[PDB]
């Protein structure tokens, strides 16, 4: 997260870190056994880390649970990034408490201008790299479809939306992929892609979770 702030320990209790000997992507806990992330984050050997603040210190409240299933959307396109969503089933159910909690799926899509919370352990610099120990947060608005398509001609599908800023300086960045965009208490987005990070006229692009609620429910119910 570039241009954000330190969230505070366990203030984003649905945020997870996907770990393979290092933090590589985020995710969102949606029930005690299932995490939503991005399809491009798929790999073997994922350990889900819940309850984290400082990802490099065991501070208390962590739960480390192996992924038992990683389900990439069958229609994920690795070139256009359409359908950039993955469901991870945990090997055992997480213990839910104030510091580890699920986030609700949306009942409707969110309108342009709605304020959202984007969070993660990604790079905090728009030029160069600095990776934080503790979780970072950014308040960012949903942008209009017409502004999103103007920024990224020919690249925005019906399953994507833009959020953030056009003036530069505030955005999600590398290491934030798969993590949450939460608006009015609902998970509306998954960090996906952009042209660089925090660049003028190039806002972040996010998977539109409202389009996948039925798919998520059907997949969980059958697994």
């Amino acid at each position: 997260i570039v241009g954000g702030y330190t969230c505070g320990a366990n203030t984003v209790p649905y945020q997870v870190s996907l770990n393979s000997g290092y933090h590589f992507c985020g995710g969102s806990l949606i029930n005690s056994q299932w995490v939503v992330s991005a399809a491009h984050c798929y790999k073997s050997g994922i350990q889900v880390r819940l309850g984290e603040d400082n990802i490099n210190v065991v501070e208390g409240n962590e739960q480390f649970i192996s992924a038992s299933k990683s389900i990439v959307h069958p229609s994920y396109n690795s070139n256009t990034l359409n359908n950039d969503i993955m469901l991870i089933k945990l090997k055992s159910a997480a213990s839910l408490n104030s510091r580890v909690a699920s986030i609700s799926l949306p009942t409707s899509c969110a309108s342009a201008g709605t304020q959202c919370l984007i969070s993660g352990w990604g790079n905090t610099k728009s030029s160069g790299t600095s990776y934080p120990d503790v979780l970072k947060c950014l308040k960012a608005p949903i942008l209009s479809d017409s502004s999103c398509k103007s920024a990224y001609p020919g690249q925005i599908t019906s399953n994507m939306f833009c959020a953030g800023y056009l003036e530069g300086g505030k955005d999600s960045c590398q290491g934030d992929s798969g993590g949450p965009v939460v608006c009015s208490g609902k998970l509306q987005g998954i960090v996906s892609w952009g042209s660089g990070c925090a660049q003028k006229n190039k806002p972040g692009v996010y998977t539109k979770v409202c389009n996948y609620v039925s798919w998520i429910k059907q997949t969980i119910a059958s697994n």
Binding site: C25, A38, G122, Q155, S172, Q174, S177, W193
Partner: peptide
């Protein structure tokens, strides 16, 4: 020019 926000990033010619 597009790149994903994973570690490591996946980038594309555009």
């Amino acid at each position: 020019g597009r790149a994903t926000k994973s570690i490591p990033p996946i980038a594309f010619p555009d």
